Curated annotation (Swiss-Prot):
Organism: Mycobacterium tuberculosis (strain CDC 1551 / Oshkosh)
Chain intervals for the UniProt region annotation (Disordered): 143-163
Family: Belongs to the RRF family.
Entry keyword annotation includes Protein biosynthesis: yes
Listed GO biological process terms: translational termination
The UniProt record lists the keyword rRNA-binding: no
Location(s) in or outside the cell: Cytoplasm
PANTHER family, per database record: MITOCHONDRIAL RIBOSOME RECYCLING FACTOR PSEUDO 1, RIBOSOME RECYCLING FACTOR
Superkingdom in the source lineage: Bacteria
Pfam families associated with the record: RRF
Name used for this protein in its record: Ribosome-recycling factor
Location, primary (coarse class): cytoplasm
Length: 183
């Protein structure tokens, strides 16, 4: 009864952490390491993100220079960024990669808004399933009489409040990203 509830809340908090991460990978004006973390290369038969194979210094708000842990790899990485949906032009001074992040085209903004909204919807749906799982658990507990009708009743109101609070937090992260996209 407490397990179903305390473990649900913790799952929710975790889904909100994941959502936050996922949303930060969204490309935007003001470059950041976040957008590169989803681009990855064939590193000896398995894949591996550019973010475990290189260091990502961000000089200007609209420039990013990268320093691969291994100098021969420098090229495969440059290829990766050139392939991304990020719509960016890579370059290299032989040991490092220069990447100037063009201004978002207006059409591309609305595009990425839709993406951010979708990630929210995804994370909110999963919070709701976490809740349904524990809610079905309390319903079980009430049927088999392993706690009083008043106990469970209280725990159902508490879960509902907790769920609402985390769904609301995900809408926040969305609205913030969407505002960040439109200036």
């Amino acid at each position: 009864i407490d397990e179903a509830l305390f473990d649900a809340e913790e799952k929710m908090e975790k889904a909100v952490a994941v959502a936050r991460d996922d949303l930060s990978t969204i490309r935007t004006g003001r470059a950041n390491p976040g957008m590169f973390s989803r681009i990855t290369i064939d590193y000896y038969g398995a894949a591996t993100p550019i973010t475990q194979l290189a260091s990502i210094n961000v000089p200007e708000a609209r420039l990013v220079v990268i320093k691969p842990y291994e100098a021969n790899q420098l090229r495969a990485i440059e290829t990766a960024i050139r392939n991304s949906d990020l719509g960016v032009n890579p370059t290299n001074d032989g040991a490092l990669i220069r990447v100037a992040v063009p201004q978002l085209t207006e059409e591309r903004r609305r595009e990425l808004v839709k993406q951010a909204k979708h990630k929210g919807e995804e994370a909110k749906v999963s919070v709701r399933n976490i809740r349904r799982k524990a809610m079905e658990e309390l319903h079980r507990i009430r049927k088999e009489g392993e706690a009083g009708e008043d106990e469970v009743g209280r725990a159902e109101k508490d879960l509902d409040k907790t769920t609402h609070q985390y769904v609301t937090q995900i809408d926040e992260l969305v609205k913030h990203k969407e505002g960040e996209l439109l200036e």
